[PDB]
XYZ file of C-alpha atoms in Angstrom:
524
model
C 0.000 0.000 0.000
C 1.935 2.998 1.299
C 5.200 3.410 -0.591
C 8.402 5.380 -0.104
C 9.806 7.250 -3.103
C 13.363 8.463 -3.696
C 14.427 10.909 -6.403
C 17.675 11.791 -8.112
C 20.848 11.525 -6.073
C 19.353 9.591 -3.143
C 18.024 6.849 -5.415
C 21.341 6.627 -7.250
C 23.400 6.342 -4.062
C 21.000 3.708 -2.706
C 21.350 1.610 -5.859
C 25.106 2.207 -5.788
C 25.387 0.932 -2.217
C 23.302 -2.146 -3.011
C 25.276 -2.966 -6.150
C 28.536 -2.381 -4.287
C 27.481 -4.834 -1.579
C 26.486 -7.465 -4.139
C 29.657 -7.024 -6.194
C 31.951 -7.081 -3.161
C 30.229 -10.301 -2.119
C 30.424 -11.958 -5.543
C 33.717 -10.652 -6.941
C 36.058 -12.096 -4.305
C 35.460 -15.471 -5.978
C 36.666 -14.217 -9.368
C 39.807 -15.773 -10.800
C 41.583 -19.091 -10.265
C 42.835 -17.903 -6.859
C 39.358 -16.939 -5.751
C 38.475 -16.463 -2.105
C 35.842 -18.461 -0.241
C 32.410 -17.106 0.701
C 30.613 -18.666 3.666
C 26.833 -18.850 3.242
C 25.509 -19.416 6.755
C 22.426 -21.643 6.718
C 19.745 -22.465 9.279
C 20.290 -26.203 8.724
C 23.308 -26.214 11.034
C 26.417 -26.388 8.852
C 27.409 -23.347 6.756
C 28.322 -24.037 3.142
C 31.578 -22.801 1.606
C 31.657 -21.960 -2.101
C 33.982 -20.331 -4.625
C 31.425 -19.884 -7.431
C 29.652 -16.568 -7.872
C 26.279 -17.993 -8.901
C 25.496 -19.356 -5.432
C 26.691 -16.204 -3.661
C 24.617 -14.022 -5.984
C 21.558 -16.212 -5.440
C 22.002 -16.168 -1.656
C 22.335 -12.406 -1.089
C 19.489 -10.083 -0.093
C 19.521 -6.726 1.671
C 17.300 -5.416 4.447
C 17.052 -1.930 2.939
C 14.481 -1.983 0.156
C 16.293 0.275 -2.319
C 19.681 -1.414 -1.947
C 17.893 -4.755 -2.130
C 16.050 -4.001 -5.366
C 19.189 -2.625 -7.000
C 20.962 -5.818 -5.984
C 18.232 -8.015 -7.461
C 18.122 -6.089 -10.733
C 21.867 -6.603 -11.169
C 21.340 -10.211 -10.065
C 18.623 -10.803 -12.655
C 20.714 -9.412 -15.503
C 23.643 -11.569 -14.356
C 21.352 -14.608 -14.226
C 20.209 -13.831 -17.769
C 23.879 -13.750 -18.771
C 24.469 -17.141 -17.151
C 21.362 -18.645 -18.757
C 22.329 -17.412 -22.222
C 26.075 -18.069 -22.261
C 26.278 -20.867 -19.690
C 28.672 -18.951 -17.413
C 30.009 -15.465 -16.752
C 27.777 -14.360 -13.874
C 30.711 -13.087 -11.814
C 32.334 -11.251 -14.725
C 28.989 -9.741 -15.714
C 28.355 -8.566 -12.152
C 31.812 -7.040 -11.694
C 31.582 -5.310 -15.081
C 28.152 -3.971 -14.144
C 29.504 -2.658 -10.846
C 32.402 -0.927 -12.597
C 30.157 0.756 -15.167
C 27.574 1.724 -12.545
C 30.134 3.228 -10.168
C 31.922 5.232 -12.853
C 28.706 6.358 -14.541
C 27.095 7.491 -11.298
C 30.274 9.358 -10.378
C 30.094 11.071 -13.774
C 26.385 11.855 -13.354
C 27.064 13.449 -9.972
C 29.530 15.657 -11.859
C 26.695 17.135 -13.921
C 26.960 14.896 -16.965
C 23.871 14.065 -19.007
C 22.884 10.464 -18.156
C 21.218 9.745 -21.507
C 24.401 10.725 -23.340
C 26.429 8.549 -20.951
C 24.167 5.614 -21.776
C 24.561 6.293 -25.499
C 28.343 6.414 -25.196
C 28.446 3.230 -23.127
C 26.274 1.435 -25.680
C 28.461 2.636 -28.558
C 31.630 1.502 -26.785
C 30.053 -1.867 -25.993
C 28.961 -2.411 -29.600
C 32.478 -1.581 -30.784
C 33.855 -3.950 -28.138
C 31.556 -6.746 -29.312
C 32.765 -6.200 -32.875
C 36.382 -6.304 -31.686
C 35.716 -9.505 -29.730
C 34.145 -11.080 -32.814
C 37.264 -10.122 -34.768
C 39.532 -11.500 -32.022
C 37.653 -14.784 -31.561
C 39.529 -17.933 -32.573
C 37.189 -20.298 -34.468
C 36.502 -23.633 -32.765
C 35.700 -26.186 -35.474
C 38.526 -28.746 -35.492
C 38.089 -31.808 -33.298
C 41.334 -30.819 -31.569
C 39.767 -27.484 -30.604
C 36.667 -29.305 -29.339
C 38.884 -31.554 -27.227
C 40.782 -28.532 -25.893
C 37.664 -26.617 -24.872
C 36.182 -29.743 -23.297
C 39.415 -30.370 -21.402
C 40.042 -26.922 -19.920
C 36.318 -26.343 -19.392
C 36.173 -29.488 -17.206
C 39.128 -28.820 -14.871
C 41.683 -30.333 -17.274
C 39.739 -33.542 -17.936
C 41.166 -34.574 -21.301
C 39.009 -37.717 -21.421
C 35.909 -35.509 -21.421
C 37.629 -33.556 -24.179
C 37.816 -36.598 -26.428
C 34.336 -37.844 -25.472
C 32.879 -34.518 -26.609
C 35.178 -34.532 -29.654
C 33.926 -37.810 -31.113
C 30.380 -36.924 -30.036
C 30.575 -33.780 -32.176
C 32.248 -35.796 -34.938
C 29.404 -38.323 -34.938
C 26.485 -35.870 -34.795
C 28.035 -32.659 -36.142
C 28.709 -29.381 -34.391
C 25.010 -28.445 -34.296
C 23.687 -31.908 -33.444
C 21.883 -32.900 -30.266
C 24.029 -34.325 -27.459
C 23.064 -35.401 -23.941
C 24.846 -37.091 -21.041
C 23.293 -39.499 -18.548
C 24.279 -42.088 -15.966
C 25.794 -45.303 -17.269
C 26.621 -48.702 -15.821
C 30.157 -50.047 -15.700
C 33.482 -48.264 -15.500
C 34.099 -47.376 -19.149
C 32.401 -44.455 -20.882
C 30.235 -45.509 -23.832
C 28.994 -43.341 -26.706
C 25.882 -44.199 -28.711
C 23.710 -42.385 -31.248
C 19.942 -42.918 -31.333
C 17.142 -41.601 -33.527
C 15.823 -38.464 -31.854
C 15.515 -34.700 -31.932
C 15.308 -31.587 -29.763
C 12.910 -28.642 -30.050
C 12.988 -25.388 -28.086
C 10.024 -25.952 -25.781
C 10.131 -26.580 -22.044
C 7.644 -27.522 -19.359
C 4.605 -25.281 -19.021
C 4.992 -25.211 -15.231
C 8.067 -25.736 -13.020
C 6.061 -28.141 -10.829
C 6.484 -30.981 -13.350
C 10.156 -31.329 -12.371
C 11.281 -34.782 -11.248
C 14.997 -33.953 -10.766
C 15.401 -30.851 -8.566
C 19.188 -31.317 -8.603
C 19.365 -30.827 -12.381
C 16.078 -28.954 -12.849
C 14.940 -31.175 -15.726
C 11.726 -33.152 -16.256
C 13.156 -36.607 -16.982
C 10.982 -39.655 -17.656
C 12.157 -43.246 -18.107
C 10.312 -45.110 -20.869
C 7.673 -42.355 -21.152
C 4.443 -42.474 -23.113
C 3.689 -39.178 -24.823
C 0.482 -37.554 -26.099
C 0.568 -35.786 -29.470
C -2.370 -33.389 -29.837
C -2.662 -30.480 -32.264
C -5.604 -28.840 -30.455
C -5.037 -26.914 -27.249
C -5.908 -28.774 -24.043
C -8.211 -26.902 -21.653
C -10.448 -29.365 -19.787
C -9.967 -32.953 -18.636
C -12.986 -34.980 -19.838
C -11.516 -35.288 -23.345
C -8.090 -36.400 -22.065
C -8.804 -38.594 -19.024
C -8.934 -41.797 -21.161
C -5.219 -41.249 -21.803
C -4.589 -41.084 -18.052
C -6.630 -44.244 -17.488
C -4.736 -46.069 -20.243
C -1.319 -45.085 -18.900
C -2.383 -45.969 -15.345
C -3.528 -49.433 -16.421
C -0.351 -49.806 -18.493
C 1.815 -48.464 -15.666
C 3.873 -46.206 -17.941
C 4.682 -42.528 -17.313
C 2.727 -39.961 -19.304
C 3.876 -36.918 -21.278
C 1.886 -34.230 -23.119
C 2.754 -32.524 -26.413
C 0.051 -30.010 -27.343
C -0.145 -26.536 -28.845
C -0.954 -24.994 -25.451
C -2.129 -26.469 -22.140
C -4.262 -24.254 -19.905
C -7.202 -24.277 -17.530
C -7.732 -26.658 -14.627
C -6.161 -29.466 -16.675
C -2.662 -28.230 -15.827
C -3.568 -27.914 -12.143
C -5.051 -31.410 -11.926
C -2.106 -32.947 -13.794
C 0.305 -31.247 -11.380
C -1.800 -32.471 -8.446
C -1.796 -36.042 -9.768
C 1.971 -35.876 -10.316
C 2.564 -34.632 -6.765
C 0.245 -37.293 -5.333
C 2.388 -39.846 -7.169
C -0.513 -41.703 -8.794
C 1.134 -41.250 -12.217
C 3.805 -38.944 -13.655
C 2.483 -36.381 -16.146
C 4.562 -33.884 -18.131
C 3.451 -31.204 -20.590
C 5.558 -29.420 -23.209
C 4.495 -26.712 -25.650
C 4.365 -27.379 -29.372
C 7.271 -25.574 -31.079
C 6.504 -22.992 -33.727
C 3.163 -21.506 -34.691
C 0.741 -21.647 -37.592
C 0.798 -24.740 -39.770
C 4.560 -25.190 -39.383
C 3.922 -26.316 -35.807
C 1.467 -28.909 -37.134
C 3.970 -30.101 -39.745
C 6.737 -30.535 -37.180
C 4.286 -32.250 -34.818
C 3.525 -34.706 -37.628
C 7.279 -35.181 -38.036
C 7.503 -35.937 -34.308
C 4.629 -38.415 -34.601
C 6.418 -40.203 -37.440
C 9.631 -40.235 -35.390
C 7.850 -41.731 -32.369
C 5.760 -44.149 -34.442
C 2.399 -42.784 -33.283
C -0.224 -40.418 -34.634
C -1.162 -36.861 -33.692
C -4.565 -35.854 -32.330
C -5.457 -33.344 -35.048
C -8.722 -31.427 -35.282
C -8.289 -30.631 -38.985
C -8.779 -34.290 -39.948
C -11.790 -34.403 -37.647
C -10.690 -37.119 -35.199
C -10.693 -36.328 -31.488
C -9.090 -37.412 -28.228
C -12.038 -39.413 -26.851
C -10.957 -42.522 -28.783
C -7.186 -42.140 -28.267
C -5.622 -45.323 -26.856
C -2.220 -46.884 -26.147
C -1.799 -48.671 -29.483
C -2.471 -45.534 -31.568
C -0.284 -43.066 -29.637
C 3.381 -42.137 -29.739
C 5.917 -43.511 -27.278
C 9.528 -42.691 -26.427
C 12.498 -44.301 -24.657
C 13.822 -41.341 -22.648
C 12.800 -37.674 -22.528
C 14.564 -34.778 -20.793
C 12.474 -31.605 -20.485
C 14.307 -28.454 -19.409
C 12.903 -24.982 -18.722
C 13.328 -23.768 -22.313
C 13.842 -26.881 -24.474
C 13.342 -30.642 -24.355
C 15.175 -33.596 -25.886
C 13.586 -36.783 -27.215
C 15.949 -39.766 -27.034
C 15.553 -42.983 -29.049
C 12.018 -42.595 -30.349
C 10.574 -46.083 -30.744
C 9.333 -46.781 -34.259
C 10.163 -48.380 -37.605
C 13.001 -46.658 -39.482
C 10.934 -46.843 -42.675
C 8.601 -44.124 -41.381
C 11.556 -41.827 -40.661
C 12.984 -42.526 -44.121
C 9.666 -41.710 -45.775
C 9.213 -38.527 -43.757
C 12.732 -37.246 -44.442
C 12.235 -38.048 -48.132
C 8.956 -36.102 -48.174
C 10.706 -33.174 -46.512
C 13.382 -33.543 -49.194
C 10.818 -32.924 -51.931
C 9.630 -30.063 -49.728
C 13.097 -28.566 -50.278
C 13.442 -29.291 -53.992
C 10.135 -27.572 -54.629
C 10.298 -24.751 -52.059
C 9.759 -21.138 -53.111
C 10.145 -18.729 -50.189
C 13.665 -18.431 -48.802
C 12.639 -18.293 -45.131
C 10.599 -21.470 -45.530
C 13.609 -22.896 -47.373
C 15.953 -22.474 -44.402
C 13.140 -23.698 -42.156
C 12.871 -26.884 -44.231
C 16.636 -27.438 -44.114
C 16.606 -27.019 -40.330
C 13.582 -29.299 -39.934
C 15.031 -32.085 -42.083
C 18.403 -31.817 -40.334
C 16.703 -32.033 -36.934
C 14.573 -35.002 -37.991
C 17.313 -37.052 -39.664
C 20.191 -36.103 -37.361
C 19.323 -38.211 -34.336
C 20.535 -37.788 -30.767
C 23.834 -38.907 -29.253
C 23.860 -39.989 -25.611
C 27.085 -40.508 -23.654
C 27.072 -42.674 -20.530
C 29.601 -41.978 -17.784
C 31.110 -44.857 -15.820
C 33.196 -44.835 -12.654
C 34.090 -46.864 -9.582
C 31.506 -45.459 -7.161
C 28.431 -43.355 -7.838
C 29.642 -40.162 -6.150
C 32.584 -39.466 -8.467
C 30.369 -40.671 -11.308
C 27.889 -37.879 -10.545
C 30.746 -35.410 -10.112
C 32.014 -36.373 -13.570
C 28.438 -35.987 -14.823
C 28.421 -32.387 -13.598
C 31.864 -31.770 -15.098
C 30.766 -33.249 -18.438
C 27.624 -31.101 -18.474
C 29.667 -27.954 -17.840
C 32.207 -28.947 -20.494
C 29.413 -29.614 -22.988
C 27.835 -26.205 -22.379
C 31.221 -24.517 -22.782
C 31.873 -26.462 -25.990
C 28.463 -25.473 -27.359
C 29.168 -21.810 -26.622
C 32.622 -22.036 -28.217
C 31.209 -23.700 -31.335
C 28.451 -21.092 -31.596
C 30.692 -18.033 -31.204
C 34.379 -18.863 -30.783
C 37.194 -18.858 -28.249
C 38.994 -15.836 -26.794
C 41.665 -15.457 -24.125
C 40.303 -16.141 -20.656
C 40.883 -14.453 -17.339
C 39.717 -11.057 -18.566
C 42.505 -10.791 -21.144
C 40.073 -10.458 -24.050
C 38.246 -7.549 -22.412
C 41.428 -5.626 -21.602
C 42.796 -6.250 -25.102
C 39.584 -4.966 -26.692
C 39.572 -1.920 -24.411
C 43.170 -1.183 -25.400
C 42.315 -1.526 -29.094
C 39.341 0.841 -28.666
C 41.336 3.700 -27.131
C 40.536 6.211 -29.903
C 36.745 5.823 -29.952
C 34.734 9.035 -29.643
C 31.069 9.980 -29.806
C 29.002 12.961 -30.869
C 29.195 14.730 -27.497
C 31.780 15.029 -24.743
C 29.407 13.151 -22.432
C 29.439 10.291 -24.938
C 33.242 10.330 -24.790
C 33.065 10.199 -20.991
C 30.748 7.202 -21.248
C 33.121 5.494 -23.672
C 36.015 6.019 -21.253
C 33.822 4.635 -18.461
C 33.138 1.512 -20.519
C 36.839 1.091 -21.324
C 37.816 1.256 -17.651
C 34.959 -1.134 -16.905
C 36.276 -3.792 -19.282
C 39.663 -3.151 -17.681
C 38.208 -3.930 -14.242
C 37.737 -7.762 -14.316
C 41.405 -8.546 -14.981
C 42.326 -6.143 -12.187
C 39.988 -8.009 -9.842
C 41.430 -11.374 -10.894
C 44.967 -10.131 -10.242
C 43.956 -8.656 -6.882
C 42.465 -12.014 -5.897
C 45.714 -13.613 -7.071
C 47.478 -11.368 -4.543
C 49.386 -9.120 -6.943
C 48.869 -5.400 -7.354
C 46.747 -5.010 -10.497
C 47.965 -1.735 -12.006
C 51.306 -3.010 -13.304
C 49.842 -6.333 -14.453
C 47.063 -4.598 -16.382
C 49.569 -2.173 -17.909
C 51.811 -5.060 -18.980
C 48.887 -6.948 -20.521
C 47.789 -3.821 -22.393
C 51.350 -3.404 -23.655
C 51.164 -6.751 -25.418
C 49.096 -7.635 -28.462
C 47.002 -10.538 -29.685
C 46.053 -13.209 -27.151
C 49.114 -12.497 -24.997
C 48.050 -12.045 -21.402
C 48.712 -12.726 -17.739
C 48.026 -16.135 -16.202
C 46.778 -15.951 -12.622
C 47.302 -19.660 -11.931
C 50.940 -19.791 -13.067
C 51.782 -16.178 -12.084
C 53.332 -15.529 -15.500
C 52.621 -13.926 -18.865
C 52.615 -15.320 -22.381
C 50.054 -16.465 -24.914
C 46.805 -17.164 -23.095
C 45.533 -19.732 -25.608
C 48.732 -21.794 -25.467
C 48.557 -21.970 -21.668
C 45.004 -23.268 -22.104
C 43.121 -20.758 -19.924
C 40.356 -19.641 -22.280
C 36.625 -18.964 -22.354
C 34.055 -18.965 -25.168
C 33.468 -15.682 -26.965
C 29.758 -16.046 -26.193
C 30.425 -15.823 -22.448
C 32.470 -12.624 -22.642
C 30.133 -11.010 -25.166
C 26.998 -11.789 -23.149
C 28.591 -10.651 -19.888
C 29.599 -7.318 -21.406
C 26.222 -6.853 -23.114
C 24.114 -7.448 -20.006
C 26.478 -5.472 -17.770
C 26.139 -2.511 -20.130
C 22.366 -2.962 -20.306
C 21.852 -2.952 -16.543
C 24.314 -0.098 -16.044
C 22.530 2.012 -18.647
C 19.207 1.224 -17.003
C 20.459 2.240 -13.568
C 22.286 5.405 -14.666
C 19.201 6.974 -16.280
C 16.919 6.166 -13.317
C 15.223 9.264 -11.891
C 12.770 7.715 -9.417
C 12.583 4.720 -7.096
C 9.341 3.239 -5.766
C 9.313 0.574 -3.061
C 7.140 -0.691 -0.235
C 7.269 1.403 2.910
C 9.214 -0.369 5.722
């Protein structure tokens, strides 16, 4: 109800204090020689971490304005992590640097809109420079390298990912799951992956991984949107009498049907999962038909007049293993005769060699590649289950890093890429002097992360940063080995996607917070 409002300088200093608290909490973990942050818990034993994601997630402030500034920086950093796969700490420290310098400039009478324009211009130029500086990652040796360093120097993971990419291409679908035995086995199965997640986060069966995983699931393929239950309860009865888990693939699920499916899942009577149909229009129907052919079943389509009252087990699609994430889901080893897949991919082939519109042409290439590519699953083996799960986590992180590197490229890690780009962009200027001030602010901001890494390493950062700027190319300073040289040769590297996303979101949040005039929050 009643709310307290702050204007101008007071709001800016409140946000500055909140962001400073968050960044001082999260940035001590930056770099190989990162400090430890103790997160006291009510359970009884405090947890000790060196990763910035947990510290950022665990921090809140009693003062409302500082708090909300902290959570806005936190949400942009979380967006950076979700997009790139890492870089939360670098994004947060960059955001703090830009925010501090920009607010200091604004207090000097500068025009905040011009500062935001200059920061955005400098960041766009920096992204272009990073794209120029990125080393392409296409050779299997490069895949092995990124998988190795990304997984704490696990070269075996490097190979595993290398032949996985060799078998299913750079853009193919790859997943990792638990495997029996000691050796690590690689296998490719007929499957695909579309960019649709669960409709509600209450369908999750694995809170540790945050993925809706079903073993030998039995899916529903319906073109019409699902609102009520009476039309779809025969499916639940059939899966209950068959004892198999249930999954839903429809255009959109809404109404009390979602609530009752969640309730049934929680009660444990039968597992139910729902995933949106990818695309829209008739393309969604076409790809749903492709999915039905892949899984050997048929789709509940209203256009052909049939309905869901008569849907049964024998005339419905089934799968071997499905992993549903927040944004996308993977179908693994769709059960069905290969002849149907061959016929469908052939039909899509004629769809190419008589396609007219270019956009639909690329869409057909992507659809046929997704349908005929298949899915590769890698099973991790070990002595006991605990190190097996640890290697699972390491393999997942390495796979995300490899995907980012393939998508964008590889640049020098440890903040060397940012400082090199800032050095190369020393002569950038804007329309106004305030724009030039903003550009200088952005340059110092990209300088900041390497300084923080060196300070964590225990060395004074001014001389190290100056020495790194003096060099060219990928030459930089290694915090682990306390020496300079080529950063790529030493192996410490990060995907270009991570650095680019961190800089982009740091600039975005800093520009948002600089131009803020008013602050509205609940009255304490």
